[PDB]
């Protein structure tokens, strides 16, 4: 994360969760890197427990997340001279969206009594709508690049850790240690316990 703090001009921890300055000594497990672009002030909608438009039918966050989001502004790469209508978002749905999953389905949503055979008729509309992005637009219409990082902790061994590998094991000394991110203090002796490989 040290190089990533200066690779991009992103917002410096406008979120609640893991300690920002201590992120070197975090051996997290099973991240899910999701990248998408939004419009205007929809960054505040991506919050744990927040109720809105994107947070209700597009991407919902649970009460416990053990993480936060990373966002930055990009009005050049996501905007062209002509109309840039390459992004679509769903606002119509039959019911609520369960978190931690995506339900992609291009289906006709009905509002009246009569149904429709996949035809946008009188009371039948479509959930997907485009994003209006232009370089001359204001702050409330600029395309914002938002990526979410989840840092849940599991009992499985951590495949990622900070570069803090040094020193050596010391035996029969009541010394402090931070093995696998767990702080403790005690002697380091041997025993007759038989340990399975897993």
């Amino acid at each position: 994360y040290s190089v990533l703090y200066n690779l991009a001009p992103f917002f410096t921890f406008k979120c609640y969760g893991v300690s920002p300055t201590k992120l070197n000594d975090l051996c997290f497990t099973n991240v899910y890197a999701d990248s998408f672009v939004i419009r205007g002030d929809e960054v505040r909608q991506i919050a744990p427990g927040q109720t809105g438009n994107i947070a209700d039918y597009n991407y919902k966050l649970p009460d416990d997340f053990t993480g936060c989001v990373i966002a930055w502004n990009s009005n050049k790469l996501d905007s062209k001279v002509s109309g840039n209508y390459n992004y679509l978002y769903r606002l119509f749905r039959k019911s609520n969206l369960k978190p931690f999953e995506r339900d992609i389905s291009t289906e006709i949503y009905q509002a009246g009594n009569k149904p429709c055979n996949g035809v946008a008729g009188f009371n039948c509309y479509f959930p997907l709508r485009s994003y209006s992005f232009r370089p001359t637009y204001g702050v409330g219409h600029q395309p914002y690049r938002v990526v979410v990082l989840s840092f849940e902790l599991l009992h499985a061994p951590a495949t990622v850790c900070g570069p803090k590998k040094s020193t050596n094991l010391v035996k029969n000394k009541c010394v402090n240690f931070n093995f696998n991110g767990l702080k403790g203090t005690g002697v380091l002796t041997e025993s007759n316990k038989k340990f399975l490989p897993f």
């Epitope: 109309g83 209508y85 679509l88 289906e107 055979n117 996949g118 035809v119 946008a120 479509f126």
Partner: antibody
């Protein structure tokens, strides 16, 4: 559709490339079809292609002539569509309209038949001649 | 395929009186859940064709209310309240099946001024 590219004095033994140039418009998530006109009274549908967003397969719907000597290829990156002809047996005059299919959903459509609602975005600017 | 016959293809029409145009489909189109699989197309000569009525007996694409189409079974027609100088353009008929689509024969629409 605001402007179209292609159309010129091309021999029947050559290759024909036709395309539509677009602007800010829901082009990526819409099915695309081609319509050409005869100098006499009457038209005929020539080609159509679906989108990759709604389904993985392209939903190829062709008549006999366009299986004979036509092909299509999308891009899924910009607002354009490329139409390529490997051979030209008999094609004297054509307008090659760029009409839009008024259907955002697909249902009960197999590889044989699929309903179409209407068209409202016909485009002019492609004129092909083989008079040499 | 499907053949389309336009019986009133050549007729002089005067402003102020309704005009009717009919098309016939070879195959039956009764397989419908309340949505008639037929629509009409208007081709303005010179710039671009336009859409008047889409699938079903409804209105879309900003069509004026003077255009009205209806039909159920072996009967199809289009009703106009009054033709004007902006109504110059040939008409076509279409059904929403038989993916090798074929247009009908073109009209002329010579308004009798």
């Amino acid at each position: 559709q605001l402007v179209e590219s292609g159309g010129g004095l091309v021999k029947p033994g050559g290759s024909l490339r036709l395309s539509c140039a677009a602007s800010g418009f829901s082009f990526i998530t819409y099915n695309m079809n081609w319509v050409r006109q005869a100098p006499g009274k009457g038209l005929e549908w020539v080609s159509s292609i679906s989108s990759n967003i709604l389904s993985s397969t392209s939903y190829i719907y062709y008549a006999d002539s366009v299986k004979g000597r036509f092909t299509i290829s999308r891009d899924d990156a910009a607002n354009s569509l490329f139409l390529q002809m490997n051979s030209l047996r008999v094609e004297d005059t054509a307008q090659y309209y760029c009409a839009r299919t008024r259907s955002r959903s697909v249902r009960n459509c197999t590889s044989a038949t699929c309903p179409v609602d209407a068209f409202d975005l016909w485009g002019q600017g492609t004129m092909v001649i083989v008079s040499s | 395929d499907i053949v389309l016959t336009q019986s009133p293809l050549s007729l002089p029409v005067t402003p102020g009186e309704p005009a009717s145009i009919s098309c016939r489909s070879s195959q039956s189109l009764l397989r419908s859940n309340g949505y008639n699989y037929l629509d009409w197309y208007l081709q303005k000569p010179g710039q671009s064709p336009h859409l008047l009525i889409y699938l079903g007996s409804n209105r879309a694409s900003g069509v004026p209310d003077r255009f009205s189409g209806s039909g159920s079974g072996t009967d199809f027609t289009l009703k106009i309240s009054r033709v004007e100088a902006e109504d110059v353009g040939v008409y076509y008929c279409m059904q929403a099946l038989q993916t090798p689509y074929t247009f009908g024969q073109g009209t002329n629409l010579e308004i009798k001024r």
